[PDB]
Amino acid sequence: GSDICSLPVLAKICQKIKLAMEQSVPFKDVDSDKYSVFPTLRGYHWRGRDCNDSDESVYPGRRPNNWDVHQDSNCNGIWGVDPKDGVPYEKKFCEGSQPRGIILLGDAAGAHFHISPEWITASQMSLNSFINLPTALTNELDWPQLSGATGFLDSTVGIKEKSIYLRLWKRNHCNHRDYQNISRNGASSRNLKKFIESLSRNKVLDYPAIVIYAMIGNDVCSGKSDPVPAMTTPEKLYSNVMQTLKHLNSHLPNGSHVILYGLPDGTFLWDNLHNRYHPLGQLNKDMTYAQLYSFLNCLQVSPCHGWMSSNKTLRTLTSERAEQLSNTLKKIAASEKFTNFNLFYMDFAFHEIIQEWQKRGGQPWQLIEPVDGFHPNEVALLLLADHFWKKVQLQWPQILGKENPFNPQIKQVFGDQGGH
Amino acid sequence: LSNGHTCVGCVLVVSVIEQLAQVHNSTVQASMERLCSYLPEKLFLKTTCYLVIDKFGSDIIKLLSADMNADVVCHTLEFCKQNTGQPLCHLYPLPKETWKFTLQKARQIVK
Ligand SMILES: CCCCCCCCCCCC(=O)O[C@H](CCCCCCCCCCC)CC(=O)O
Ligand SMILES: *[C@@H]1O[C@H](CO)[C@@H](O[C@@H]2O[C@H](CO)[C@@H](O)[C@H](O)[C@H]2NC(C)=O)[C@H](O)[C@H]1NC(C)=O
Ligand SMILES: *[C@@H]1O[C@H](CO)[C@@H](O[C@@H]2O[C@H](CO)[C@@H](O)[C@H](O)[C@H]2NC(C)=O)[C@H](O)[C@H]1NC(C)=O
Ligand SMILES: CCCCCCCCCCC[C@@H](O)CC(=O)O
Ligand SMILES: CCCCCCCCCCC[C@@H](O)CC(=O)O
Numbered sequence: 001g002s003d004i005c006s007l008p009v010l011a012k013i014c015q016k017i018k019l020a021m022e023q024s025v026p027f028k029d030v031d032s033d034k035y036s037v038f039p040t041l042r043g044y045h046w047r048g049r050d051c052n053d054s055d056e057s058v059y060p061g062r063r064p065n066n067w068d069v070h071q072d073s074n075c076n077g078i079w080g081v082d083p084k085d086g087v088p089y090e091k092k093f094c095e096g097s098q099p100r101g102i103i104l105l106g107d108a109a110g111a112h113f114h115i116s117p118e119w120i121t122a123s124q125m126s127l128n129s130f131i132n133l134p135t136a137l138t139n140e141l142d143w144p145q146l147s148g149a150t151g152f153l154d155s156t157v158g159i160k161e162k163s164i165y166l167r168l169w170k171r172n173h174c175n176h177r178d179y180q181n182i183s184r185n186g187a188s189s190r191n192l193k194k195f196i197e198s199l200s201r202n203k204v205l206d207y208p209a210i211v212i213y214a215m216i217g218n219d220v221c222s223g224k225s226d227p228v229p230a231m232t233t234p235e236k237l238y239s240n241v242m243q244t245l246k247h248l249n250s251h252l253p254n255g256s257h258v259i260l261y262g263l264p265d266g267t268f269l270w271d272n273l274h275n276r277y278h279p280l281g282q283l284n285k286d287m288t289y290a291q292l293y294s295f296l297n298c299l300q301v302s303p304c305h306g307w308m309s310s311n312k313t314l315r316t317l318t319s320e321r322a323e324q325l326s327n328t329l330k331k332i333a334a335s336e337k338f339t340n341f342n343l344f345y346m347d348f349a350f351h352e353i354i355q356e357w358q359k360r361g362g363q364p365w366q367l368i369e370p371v372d373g374f375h376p377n378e379v380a381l382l383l384l385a386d387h388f389w390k391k392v393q394l395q396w397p398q399i400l401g402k403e404n405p406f407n408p409q410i411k412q413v414f415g416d417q418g419g420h
Numbered sequence: 421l422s423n424g425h426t427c428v429g430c431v432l433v434v435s436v437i438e439q440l441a442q443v444h445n446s447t448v449q450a451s452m453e454r455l456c457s458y459l460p461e462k463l464f465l466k467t468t469c470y471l472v473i474d475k476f477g478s479d480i481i482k483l484l485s486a487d488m489n490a491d492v493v494c495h496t497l498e499f500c501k502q503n504t505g506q507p508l509c510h511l512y513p514l515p516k517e518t519w520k521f522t523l524q525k526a527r528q529i530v531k
């Protein structure tokens with residue numbers, strides 16, 4: 001009787017918001033092409049900003065509509081005609097460069113789940129602490145605009161590394177805005193089918209895409225008292241992934257690439273954090289991550305009982321299963337073939353990330369979200385993107401394409417290409 | 421009514437309230453007013469914060485002014501519930517010998 005959502009005008013707004021969140025598509029999306037002019041609520045913080053929200057045929061990643069003579073049809077900021085010779089700018093600057101988008105099929109880490117310690121640390125709390133809170137809530141507490149795969153804002157942390165998207169734009173400026181973070185906090189191989197349709201890519205009308213499949217925890221993470229039986233089996237993961245890959249084959253244009261990320265060895269969490277104080281326990285040094293883990297497990301609300309546990313036996317079983325699921329992904333990429341994309345596998349390899357972080361004078365505990373003591377933070381995600389880029393450069397240079405020779409001219413004629 | 425999430429939430433909120441009053445060496449009432457004053461008007465966050473004070477503020481004041489930690493507060497106010505035979509869920513060091521006596525006293529305070 002109280003709820004606004006039964007009011008005359010707000011009823012349709014309510015349902016539209018809920019439907020958008022159910023489907024993980026932008027709430028503000030007039031032409032319904034899944035790209036938005038609004039940042040949050042699955043908006044352009046998650047995907048490229050829609051340069052024309054009144055034209056479903058205009059969105060990031062689309063092949064140019066007659067070389068974008070009269071309209072920038074792919075929101076990359078490149079359009080018009082050069083009066084010097086009458087040649088369309090997109091033709092001379094982008095044709096033959098083989099543009100491509102970046103797509104992340106991921107979980108809380110890929111979307112960069114982050115509860116700010118400023119929100120719960122009384123010693124430093126102020127009015128400025130919560131200015132970012134409305135944005136984070138309407139982003140489901142994710143920060144994809146700063147993530148390691150699809151981040152495009154200037155980083156909070158002091159390290160220079162960029163997201164995969166911005167490294168892809170830098171290589172070929174025609175890829176401006178062609179990013180999509182298709183991730184959910186609880187996403188796994190089991191439930192990716194429930195929002196795989198939120199992916200935007202037309203097999204025939206859009207450019208190819210690099211797709212990162214990064215279900216890197218939820219298949220072995222659970223809050224149940226006995227979390228072992230709840231973990232995905234290698235047989236079921238294979239079955240789940242194959243359905244996903246089969247779905248991608250009928251949506252991705254030819255020339256696409258799918259990269260399967262292995263699962264981490266989460267034992268480094270307990271090892272590096274169980275003695276350290278949680279933000280809530282820093283004022284009076286009376287709460288550690290060990291105390292937090294035990295609290296959450298008693299309540300059965302831990303994001304990952306298997307790894308966030310004092311029970312070494314359980315931590316060992318979780319990594320063992322994660323190793324088996326990673327090997328299953330390795331065997332899918334090595335042996336499964338699809339007409340419209342090539343497959344690749346990459347170990348999570350967080351030990352290599354720690355070593356790199358240690359080279360720069362850092363310690364492992366500084367790579368984990370302070371509040372939840374589980375997810376990798378912005379530092380770790382950018383270091384994972386750096387490791388990703390260099391490995392693909394070394395092993396599969398074709399995935400990233402070639403450096404576009406016309407990048408300087410694109411910058412000179414179009415500048416920031418419209419921003420994000 | 422009460423599940424594992426309301427228990428976490430209560431312990432978090434009461435913990436921040438208690439630690440704000442300590443940091444600013446203030447009363448609990450002033451700490452709760454400080455917290456809400458920090459929260460934006462957007463998304464009804466500030467208003468919702470003041471409504472929580474309206475409903476639970478007076479009980480929180482009485483318990484926190486008697487030097488009971490967030491665990492005792494949230495169990496007393498029924499945000500956390502120890503079911504028969506099930507283990508005791510707590511976030512801060514807990515002396516088991518006196519827990520029930522402490523909880524008994526806490527109930528008398530808000531009675
Ligand atoms: C080091 C291993 C890296 C694993 C990264 C991927 C993690 C995926 C599994 C976890 C899924 C997820 O993060 O859980 C989300 C919500 C996270 C909530 C954490 C809150 C902690 C308790 C309350 C905080 C107050 C202390 C699942 C979801 O909500 O959908
Ligand atoms: C976005 O696209 C629309 C057309 O789809 C442009 O708006 C006008 O749309 C109607 C036809 O649908 C007509 O008034 C014109 O054909 C369009 N305008 C022009 C100038 O052609 C709109 O201009 C586009 N937005 C941008 C920024 O180019
Ligand atoms: C530590 O973790 C282990 C592994 O989960 C628990 O051992 C039991 O293992 C058997 C089979 O190996 C399972 O069927 C039981 O369900 C497990 N116990 C529980 C409670 O789930 C062991 O109990 C854990 N230790 C503690 C103190 O909980
Ligand atoms: C101290 C007052 C402000 C505190 C704000 C804390 C934000 C709440 C975090 C809840 C996170 C989980 O719920 C994630 C989820 O599953 O959605
Ligand atoms: C006394 C301070 C009040 C503390 C507020 C407690 C917040 C309640 C969290 C409930 C979370 C559910 O809505 C969603 C879920 O199931 O995760």
Ligand SMILES: *[C@@H]1O[C@H](CO)[C@@H](O)[C@H](O)[C@H]1NC(C)=O
Pocket residue numbers: 254255256339340
């Ligand atoms: C793409 O697929 C077509 C068939 O769909 C095939 O003939 C062609 O050789 C492939 N080439 C590339 C670059 O994907």
Ligand SMILES: *[C@@H]1O[C@H](CO)[C@@H](O)[C@H](O)[C@H]1NC(C)=O
Pocket residue numbers: 445446
């Ligand atoms: C804290 O504030 C009280 C006033 O309520 C004052 O008497 C006391 O000296 C203060 N203590 C410190 C350490 O600031």
Ligand SMILES: [Ca+2]
Pocket residue numbers: 029030031032033034035036050052053054
């Ligand atoms: Ca749109």
Ligand SMILES: [Ca+2]
Pocket residue numbers: 031033035050051052053054055056057058059
């Ligand atoms: Ca559009």
Ligand SMILES: [Ca+2]
Pocket residue numbers: 064068071072073074075076077078079090
């Ligand atoms: Ca264009």
